[PDB]
């Protein structure tokens, strides 16, 4: 930029998208990465392996393709995150992927967060991912009990679009039930 001696960072560092130091420590395992990414409205979960010309995604799952199985609820929450991970993990089992290591990217390792839910989901699907049980959320928050007990403090409705009134976290149960069944079209 200023002259010949100027050192311009790597493209994905310039864009503030990849933590290259964490990436090396992640790639050292030899196991595929469980790329857990978020958005304001959605949640993504990819199973990435290393390739000659760049990264190879073997099995992905976005929270948008969750509705394809019967999700009439919002897509940027805790129940959505688990189910997106479970969907990614099941597609991975069909691809031959047996083990993975959790990549959270530039997200924070905050206890009980959405990226750990994506992890809990993928493990429940049959994948062997190095985890820590007490860093994951309590089973009820993963169900969406925190959102139901927030709708108890009503007066004004939480959801704008008509789904329901007092909220149904029983839909999570009705979705985990559908995905655990082997007859499903992945």
């Amino acid at each position: 930029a200023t002259g010949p001696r100027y050192k311009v960072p790597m493209r994905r560092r310039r864009e503030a998208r990849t933590d290259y130091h964490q990436r090396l420590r992640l790639l050292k395992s030899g196991k595929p990465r469980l790329v857990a990414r978020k958005s304001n409205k959605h949640v993504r979960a990819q199973l990435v392996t290393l390739g000659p010309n760049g990264d190879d995604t073997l099995a992905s799952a976005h929270s948008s393709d969750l509705a394809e199985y019967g999700w009439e609820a919002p897509t940027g929450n805790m129940p959505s995150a688990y189910l997106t991970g479970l969907l990614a993990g099941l597609r991975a089992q069909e691809a031959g992927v047996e083990e993975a290591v959790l990549d959270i990217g530039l997200n924070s390792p905050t206890p009980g967060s959405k990226v750990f839910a994506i992890q809990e989901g993928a493990i429940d699907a049959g994948l062997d991912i190095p985890h820590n049980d007490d860093v994951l959320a309590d089973w009820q928050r993963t169900r969406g009990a925190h959102i139901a007990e927030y709708d108890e403090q009503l007066e004004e409705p939480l959801y704008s679009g008509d789904f329901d009134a007092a909220d149904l976290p029983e839909h999570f149960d009705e979705l985990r039930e559908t995905l655990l069944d082997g007859d499903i079209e992945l």
Binding site: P4, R5, K7, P9, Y20, R23, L24, L27
Partner: protein, 95 residues
């Protein structure tokens, strides 16, 4: 030489060109080589660990197994056969 240390007379070879400064890309640090493969030996100035003796910079050895994550590469120094312990970060595949 005035001193006989390992990093003697290595101002040139163990220094980077200003544009190649900073942390090196992870891809070549995790590269997998097979036994029998011919590899070029060149220390990456930005990577501290897994280096060999600077006297061997420029050698083209043959991978003959591994010790942990590092590789055991066979070279011929003059007329003497030597086995070098080196990580992928300092290795490049021939051709």
């Amino acid at each position: 030489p005035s001193s006989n240390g390992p990093l003697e007379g290595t101002r040139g070879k163990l220094k980077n060109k200003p544009r190649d400064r900073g942390t090196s890309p992870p891809q070549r640090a995790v590269e997998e080589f097979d036994d029998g493969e011919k590899v070029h030996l060149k220390i990456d100035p930005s990577v501290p660990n897994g280096r060999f003796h600077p006297r061997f910079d420029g050698q083209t050895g043959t991978v003959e197994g591994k010790q942990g994550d590092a590789y055991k590469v066979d070279i011929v120094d003059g007329g003497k056969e030597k086995t070098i312990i080196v990580t992928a970060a300092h290795l490049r595949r021939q051709e």
